[PDB]
């Protein structure tokens, strides 16, 4: 997908 | 005074989480981007689907309009940016040069330059006409969450997971300013105020801060929302009352009075994290967009 829609841990 | 935004339309069609929504400067259109690799164009006033723009090999984290509403730029996990002619749907340029995902992008007010931020911890400045990289700024030591030009394009503001907000001279590339407050939370968003005198920044400690960039001083704080994981856009709402608008990880849109920092409204109806909001340039219209469990865009209209 996309990094923004995955977020930061 | 308090706004009275109400839901008018819900826009379905993205098959994966929505990443960003932006109104065109002429106020005719809404552009959305998604993890599904697609840009979608919708009517800003009715929400009627206009068209789909494709070509990225991986998901898109950001999309942004040119000043004349003719061009889009998209930033994707395929490590490229793409410049698109909206009317014809053509990819006019593919900006290669980042070595990791591209997270954020914007045009300058002239729209002869594009700024990009990447997981490779750099900020890049690209020439719109040729698609060639003009400058690579070693901006940060962690992924860059946002980039934005000021009103005349002489200044670029960037934010990063490293907790820093930095101001760069577009022409020269030197770091003019580094901004950080008492703690070191990751900075998930930043943007200049419409007059260019302030920058609004989001940190992953449930906080929005309005900064006077010249004095290096935090002027306002906005709290009460949930922001700890996601790079959520925030906006200045100026068509009616002067508000600060932001999505939230509790699935609501939050609207604060800019001066009093009071929450004046919460918009309910999304079923996942509200990752993105945008404000229409002439009408009191908010567009909001949410993550994988929701996949929709919502338009809200108010009287002030």
Author numbering:
A (entry chain D): 40 to 48
B (entry chain B): 31 to 334
Q: What did the authors write?
A:
pmcWDR5, a well-established core scaffolding protein found in histone methyltransferase complexes MLL1-4 and SET1A/B, was initially characterized as an epigenetic histone “writer” to recognize histone H3 lysine 4 (H3K4) and is essential for H3K4 di- and tri-methylation (H3K4me2 and H3K4me3) to activate gene transcription. Two separate and non-overlapping sites located on opposite surfaces of WDR5 mediate most of its interactions with binding partners: an arginine-bearing cavity located on the surface known as the WDR5-interacting (WIN) site, and a shallow cleft on the opposite side referred to as the WDR5-binding (WBM) site. In mice, methyl-CpG binding domain 3 isoform C (MBD3C) interacts specifically with the histone H3 binding protein WD repeat-containing protein 5 (WDR5) and forms the WDR5-MBD3C/Norde complex. The residues Val31-Cys334 of WDR5 are visible and consist of seven WD40 repeats that form a seven-bladed β-propeller structure.
Taken together, these data collectively indicated that both MBD3C Phe47 and the residues connecting MBD3C Arg43 and Phe47 are crucial for its interaction with the WDR5 B site.
